[PDB]
Amino acid sequence: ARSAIEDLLFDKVTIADPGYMQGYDDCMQQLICA
Amino acid sequence: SSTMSQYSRSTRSMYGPLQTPVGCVLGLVNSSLFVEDCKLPL
Ligand SMILES: *[C@@H]1O[C@H](CO)[C@@H](O)[C@H](O)[C@H]1NC(C)=O
Protein backbone atom coordinates (compact mmCIF):
# COMPACT_ATOMS: atom_id res chain seq x y z
CA ALA A 1 0.00 0.00 0.00
CA ARG A 2 1.67 3.14 1.08
CA SER A 3 5.35 2.54 0.96
CA ALA A 4 7.18 2.58 4.28
CA ILE A 5 9.38 5.46 3.13
CA GLU A 6 6.27 7.45 2.27
CA ASP A 7 4.64 6.12 5.43
CA LEU A 8 7.38 7.86 7.40
CA LEU A 9 7.17 10.89 5.12
CA PHE A 10 3.41 11.22 5.57
CA ASP A 11 3.28 10.59 9.31
CA LYS A 12 6.25 12.79 10.20
CA VAL A 13 4.89 15.84 8.37
CA THR A 14 1.92 17.63 9.91
CA ILE A 15 -1.11 16.72 7.79
CA ALA A 16 -4.66 17.77 8.60
CA ASP A 17 -7.03 15.52 6.65
CA PRO A 18 -9.86 17.20 4.69
CA GLY A 19 -12.27 14.27 5.16
CA TYR A 20 -12.32 12.23 1.94
CA MET A 21 -15.00 9.80 3.07
CA GLN A 22 -17.17 11.22 5.91
CA GLY A 23 -15.22 14.21 7.22
CA TYR A 24 -18.37 16.33 7.29
CA ASP A 25 -19.89 13.73 9.60
CA ASP A 26 -16.63 13.73 11.62
CA CYS A 27 -17.40 17.24 12.83
CA MET A 28 -21.20 17.26 12.81
CA GLN A 29 -21.23 14.52 15.46
CA GLN A 30 -17.69 14.75 16.90
CA LEU A 31 -8.87 23.49 10.76
CA ILE A 32 -11.02 21.62 8.24
CA CYS A 33 -14.28 21.66 10.18
CA ALA A 34 -14.93 25.41 9.88
CA SER B 1 -35.12 16.51 -0.18
CA SER B 2 -36.11 17.45 3.46
CA THR B 3 -33.79 20.25 4.60
CA MET B 4 -32.49 22.22 1.60
CA SER B 5 -31.83 25.90 0.89
CA GLN B 6 -31.75 28.17 -2.21
CA TYR B 7 -34.11 26.93 -4.92
CA SER B 8 -35.62 23.43 -4.80
CA ARG B 9 -34.23 20.26 -6.38
CA SER B 10 -34.68 19.07 -9.98
CA THR B 11 -35.14 15.30 -10.32
CA ARG B 12 -37.08 13.25 -12.89
CA SER B 13 -35.58 9.81 -13.52
CA MET B 14 -37.33 7.70 -10.89
CA TYR B 15 -33.22 4.87 -7.93
CA GLY B 16 -32.01 4.89 -4.34
CA PRO B 17 -29.04 7.06 -3.39
CA LEU B 18 -25.68 5.33 -3.56
CA GLN B 19 -22.91 5.69 -1.00
CA THR B 20 -19.61 6.42 -2.75
CA PRO B 21 -16.20 7.07 -1.17
CA VAL B 22 -16.56 10.70 -2.22
CA GLY B 23 -20.03 10.87 -0.65
CA CYS B 24 -23.67 10.20 -1.55
CA VAL B 25 -24.84 10.21 -5.16
CA LEU B 26 -28.16 10.53 -6.99
CA GLY B 27 -28.86 9.87 -10.64
CA LEU B 28 -26.39 6.99 -10.93
CA VAL B 29 -26.46 3.22 -11.31
CA ASN B 30 -24.18 0.74 -9.59
CA SER B 31 -21.86 -0.93 -12.10
CA SER B 32 -18.55 -2.70 -11.43
CA LEU B 33 -16.92 -1.57 -14.65
CA PHE B 34 -13.41 -0.28 -15.37
CA VAL B 35 -12.51 2.41 -17.91
CA GLU B 36 -8.99 3.78 -18.38
CA ASP B 37 -9.73 6.94 -20.32
CA CYS B 38 -12.65 8.74 -18.67
CA LYS B 39 -13.38 11.99 -20.50
CA LEU B 40 -15.19 13.27 -17.40
CA PRO B 41 -13.76 11.52 -14.32
CA LEU B 42 -16.11 11.97 -11.36
C1 LIG C 1 -22.59 -1.39 -5.44
O1 LIG C 1 -22.97 -2.66 -4.90
C2 LIG C 1 -22.00 -3.24 -4.01
C3 LIG C 1 -22.53 -4.60 -3.63
O2 LIG C 1 -23.57 -5.01 -4.50
C4 LIG C 1 -21.79 -2.31 -2.82
O3 LIG C 1 -20.79 -2.86 -1.97
C5 LIG C 1 -21.38 -0.93 -3.29
O4 LIG C 1 -21.29 -0.04 -2.18
C6 LIG C 1 -22.38 -0.38 -4.31
N1 LIG C 1 -21.93 0.90 -4.82
C7 LIG C 1 -22.42 2.07 -4.39
C8 LIG C 1 -21.84 3.30 -5.04
O5 LIG C 1 -23.28 2.14 -3.53
Side-chain angles (χ1 to χ4, degrees):
Chain A
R2 297 190 138 161
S3 77
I5 174 65
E6 87 168 348
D7 282 322
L8 296 154
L9 194 61
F10 286 166
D11 174 74
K12 283 292 290 296
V13 70
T14 311
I15 301 167
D17 184 74
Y20 286 154
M21 72 292 291
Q22 273 88 16
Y24 159 77
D25 297 335
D26 297 340
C27 187
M28 68 181 181
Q29 54 89 30
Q30 154 181 22
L31 265 68
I32 320 169
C33 170
Chain B
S1 298
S2 77
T3 60
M4 312 335 297
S5 66
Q6 48 95 24
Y7 183 76
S8 167
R9 185 63 190 92
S10 173
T11 313
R12 324 292 164 234
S13 298
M14 185 63 72
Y15 200 51
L18 292 179
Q19 187 67 53
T20 66
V22 287
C24 188
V25 75
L26 290 170
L28 280 194
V29 62
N30 203 339
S31 62
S32 188
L33 306 177
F34 282 78
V35 169
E36 183 178 1
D37 49 325
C38 202
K39 281 188 303 306
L40 189 46
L42 171 50

PDB file of all heavy atoms in Angstrom, chain A residues 20-22, chain B residues 19 21-22:
ATOM      1  N   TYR A  20     -11.964  12.789   3.241  1.00  0.00           N
ATOM      2  CA  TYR A  20     -12.322  12.233   1.937  1.00  0.00           C
ATOM      3  C   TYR A  20     -13.650  11.486   1.992  1.00  0.00           C
ATOM      4  O   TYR A  20     -14.475  11.595   1.078  1.00  0.00           O
ATOM      5  CB  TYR A  20     -11.219  11.297   1.440  1.00  0.00           C
ATOM      6  CG  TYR A  20      -9.973  11.998   0.964  1.00  0.00           C
ATOM      7  CD1 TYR A  20      -8.744  11.355   0.991  1.00  0.00           C
ATOM      8  CD2 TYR A  20     -10.024  13.296   0.483  1.00  0.00           C
ATOM      9  CE1 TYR A  20      -7.599  11.989   0.557  1.00  0.00           C
ATOM     10  CE2 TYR A  20      -8.884  13.939   0.050  1.00  0.00           C
ATOM     11  CZ  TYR A  20      -7.675  13.280   0.085  1.00  0.00           C
ATOM     12  OH  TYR A  20      -6.535  13.918  -0.346  1.00  0.00           O
ATOM     13  N   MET A  21     -13.874  10.722   3.057  1.00  0.00           N
ATOM     14  CA  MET A  21     -15.003   9.800   3.074  1.00  0.00           C
ATOM     15  C   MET A  21     -16.218  10.351   3.832  1.00  0.00           C
ATOM     16  O   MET A  21     -17.302  10.466   3.253  1.00  0.00           O
ATOM     17  CB  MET A  21     -14.500   8.426   3.568  1.00  0.00           C
ATOM     18  CG  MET A  21     -14.130   8.259   5.041  1.00  0.00           C
ATOM     19  SD  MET A  21     -12.649   9.199   5.457  1.00  0.00           S
ATOM     20  CE  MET A  21     -11.403   8.286   4.556  1.00  0.00           C
ATOM     21  N   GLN A  22     -16.062  10.711   5.105  1.00  0.00           N
ATOM     22  CA  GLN A  22     -17.171  11.217   5.909  1.00  0.00           C
ATOM     23  C   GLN A  22     -16.703  12.322   6.840  1.00  0.00           C
ATOM     24  O   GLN A  22     -17.154  12.419   7.984  1.00  0.00           O
ATOM     25  CB  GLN A  22     -17.836  10.099   6.711  1.00  0.00           C
ATOM     26  CG  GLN A  22     -18.933   9.365   5.958  1.00  0.00           C
ATOM     27  CD  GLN A  22     -18.425   8.208   5.135  1.00  0.00           C
ATOM     28  OE1 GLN A  22     -17.305   7.742   5.323  1.00  0.00           O
ATOM     29  NE2 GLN A  22     -19.246   7.743   4.202  1.00  0.00           N
TER      30      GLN A  22
ATOM     31  N   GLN B  19     -24.022   5.221  -1.812  1.00  0.00           N
ATOM     32  CA  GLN B  19     -22.912   5.691  -1.003  1.00  0.00           C
ATOM     33  C   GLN B  19     -21.597   5.394  -1.711  1.00  0.00           C
ATOM     34  O   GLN B  19     -21.238   4.231  -1.917  1.00  0.00           O
ATOM     35  CB  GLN B  19     -22.929   5.039   0.378  1.00  0.00           C
ATOM     36  CG  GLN B  19     -21.892   5.611   1.317  1.00  0.00           C
ATOM     37  CD  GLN B  19     -22.187   7.044   1.690  1.00  0.00           C
ATOM     38  OE1 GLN B  19     -23.285   7.365   2.137  1.00  0.00           O
ATOM     39  NE2 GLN B  19     -21.210   7.919   1.497  1.00  0.00           N
ATOM     40  N   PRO B  21     -17.277   6.536  -2.021  1.00  0.00           N
ATOM     41  CA  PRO B  21     -16.201   7.070  -1.171  1.00  0.00           C
ATOM     42  C   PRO B  21     -16.117   8.584  -1.167  1.00  0.00           C
ATOM     43  O   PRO B  21     -15.695   9.168  -0.164  1.00  0.00           O
ATOM     44  CB  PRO B  21     -14.944   6.436  -1.773  1.00  0.00           C
ATOM     45  CG  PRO B  21     -15.426   5.158  -2.341  1.00  0.00           C
ATOM     46  CD  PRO B  21     -16.803   5.431  -2.871  1.00  0.00           C
ATOM     47  N   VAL B  22     -16.514   9.244  -2.253  1.00  0.00           N
ATOM     48  CA  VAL B  22     -16.564  10.697  -2.221  1.00  0.00           C
ATOM     49  C   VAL B  22     -17.821  11.220  -1.544  1.00  0.00           C
ATOM     50  O   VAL B  22     -17.864  12.403  -1.185  1.00  0.00           O
ATOM     51  CB  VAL B  22     -16.447  11.286  -3.633  1.00  0.00           C
ATOM     52  CG1 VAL B  22     -15.036  11.149  -4.133  1.00  0.00           C
ATOM     53  CG2 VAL B  22     -17.376  10.560  -4.564  1.00  0.00           C
TER      54      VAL B  22
END
